[PDB]
Enzyme design. Structure first.
Site, mmCIF file in Angstrom:
data_model
loop_
_atom_site.group_PDB
_atom_site.id
_atom_site.type_symbol
_atom_site.label_atom_id
_atom_site.label_comp_id
_atom_site.label_asym_id
_atom_site.label_seq_id
_atom_site.Cartn_x
_atom_site.Cartn_y
_atom_site.Cartn_z
ATOM 1 N N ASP A 84 38.487 -7.331 39.541
ATOM 2 C CA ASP A 84 38.301 -6.530 39.464
ATOM 3 C C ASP A 84 38.532 -5.549 38.609
ATOM 4 O OD1 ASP A 84 38.108 -3.921 41.158
ATOM 5 O OD2 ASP A 84 39.880 -4.376 42.758
ATOM 6 N N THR A 85 36.907 -4.036 37.943
ATOM 7 C CA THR A 85 37.359 -4.016 37.190
ATOM 8 C C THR A 85 38.446 -2.598 36.903
ATOM 9 O OG1 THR A 85 35.010 -2.800 37.393
ATOM 10 C CG2 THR A 85 35.434 -4.496 35.498
ATOM 11 N N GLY A 86 38.182 -2.395 38.737
ATOM 12 C CA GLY A 86 38.702 -1.220 38.608
ATOM 13 C C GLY A 86 40.663 -1.393 39.246
HETATM 14 C C1 LIG Z 1 40.576 2.225 44.603
HETATM 15 C C2 LIG Z 1 40.149 1.410 42.804
HETATM 16 C C3 LIG Z 1 40.879 3.077 41.363
HETATM 17 C C4 LIG Z 1 42.185 1.199 42.920
HETATM 18 N N1 LIG Z 1 41.569 -0.839 43.869
HETATM 19 C C5 LIG Z 1 40.874 -1.166 43.238
HETATM 20 C C6 LIG Z 1 39.713 -1.604 44.074
HETATM 21 O O1 LIG Z 1 38.479 -2.393 43.752
HETATM 22 C C7 LIG Z 1 40.064 -1.469 45.550
HETATM 23 C C8 LIG Z 1 40.276 -3.928 45.396
HETATM 24 C C9 LIG Z 1 40.398 -3.983 47.138
HETATM 25 C C10 LIG Z 1 39.187 -4.672 47.884
HETATM 26 C C11 LIG Z 1 39.373 -4.834 49.396
HETATM 27 C C12 LIG Z 1 40.542 -4.387 49.905
HETATM 28 C C13 LIG Z 1 41.825 -3.531 49.056
HETATM 29 C C14 LIG Z 1 41.522 -3.597 47.302
HETATM 30 N N2 LIG Z 1 39.111 -1.856 46.047
HETATM 31 C C15 LIG Z 1 38.600 -0.697 47.190
HETATM 32 O O2 LIG Z 1 39.606 -0.071 47.252
HETATM 33 O O3 LIG Z 1 37.184 -0.708 47.295
HETATM 34 C C16 LIG Z 1 36.944 0.159 49.263
HETATM 35 C C17 LIG Z 1 35.521 1.066 48.530
HETATM 36 O O4 LIG Z 1 34.530 -0.464 49.540
HETATM 37 C C18 LIG Z 1 35.569 -0.981 50.157
HETATM 38 O O5 LIG Z 1 35.186 -2.445 49.523
HETATM 39 C C19 LIG Z 1 36.953 -2.993 48.911
HETATM 40 C C20 LIG Z 1 37.822 -1.907 50.187
HETATM 41 C C21 LIG Z 1 37.391 -0.495 50.156
HETATM 42 S S1 LIG Z 1 43.536 -0.744 44.017
HETATM 43 O O6 LIG Z 1 43.085 -1.958 44.578
HETATM 44 O O7 LIG Z 1 43.456 0.526 45.708
HETATM 45 C C22 LIG Z 1 44.730 -1.646 43.389
HETATM 46 C C23 LIG Z 1 45.216 -0.463 42.574
HETATM 47 C C24 LIG Z 1 45.981 -1.037 41.102
HETATM 48 C C25 LIG Z 1 45.864 -2.332 40.899
HETATM 49 N N3 LIG Z 1 46.521 -2.482 39.896
HETATM 50 C C26 LIG Z 1 45.257 -3.126 42.013
HETATM 51 C C27 LIG Z 1 44.471 -2.730 42.665
#
Ligand SMILES: CC(C)CN(C[C@@H](O)[C@H](Cc1ccccc1)NC(=O)O[C@H]1CO[C@H]2OCC[C@H]21)S(=O)(=O)c1ccc(N)cc1
Lengths: 99, 99
Positions: A25-27
């Site tokens: 996860d690059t995000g």
């Molecule tokens: C919103 C980002 C800037 C940060 N996130 C990583 C992100 O990749 C999350 C990672 C993620 C993936 C699945 C479930 C929860 C979080 N993805 C996400 O929120 O995606 C949403 C939009 O597309 C959908 O697909 C997945 C969820 C929806 S995060 O999960 O909140 C996160 C924040 C801080 C850290 N150290 C690790 C992870």
């Protein structure tokens, strides 16, 4: 290898003597894994994303193997719905984004 | 380009004629942008992240240029903490993970 993004980039990891599936996860600044009983010291942390924040336990200098590549660094543990490999460990295994 | 991950993979995007900064987010299925005025018809949707679920406006078939590469796809607009480019658009610009 090269991982396309048609599907979620889930890979097998090894941590704390257990094999798990986790998202490259690059995000994510930092790796966060689903709840597990790791030994050792930890510090409370809050991490935020879509929907708000969750409380996690920050463990330092934790060994993880990611698709055969070893890494050691910060691993957060908490009520995340998915295991997430963040940038902190992805740099250590040589992972880049390419287009 | 080849993008390393020691820093956040932020890129300039153009959508609705306006320039913004966004995060290339391989952990996101979908593209979610902060509140903005966008032309087109939209539908109300819910999306879930690490902290819970939020209400978003779903815009279909939106033109968006990402670091010089054009995409046309779904864009969600709502109270996300950061502009994130998800896999739905990263596939269109040919983005892969490599290590
Ligand atoms: C919103 C980002 C800037 C940060 N996130 C990583 C992100 O990749 C999350 C990672 C993620 C993936 C699945 C479930 C929860 C979080 N993805 C996400 O929120 O995606 C949403 C939009 O597309 C959908 O697909 C997945 C969820 C929806 S995060 O999960 O909140 C996160 C924040 C801080 C850290 N150290 C690790 C992870």
């Amino acid at each position: 290898p090269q991982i396309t993004l048609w599907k979620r980039p889930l890979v097998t990891i090894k941590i704390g003597g257990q094999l798990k599936e986790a998202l490259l996860d690059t995000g994510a600044d930092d790796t966060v894994l689903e709840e597990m009983n790791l030994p050792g010291r930890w510090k409370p942390k809050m991490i935020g994303g879509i929907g708000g924040f969750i409380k996690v336990r920050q463990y330092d200098q934790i060994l993880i193997e990611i698709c055969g590549h070893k890494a050691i660094g910060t691993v957060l543990v908490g009520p995340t719905p998915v295991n997430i490999i963040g940038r902190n460990l992805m740099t250590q295994i040589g992972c880049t984004l390419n287009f």
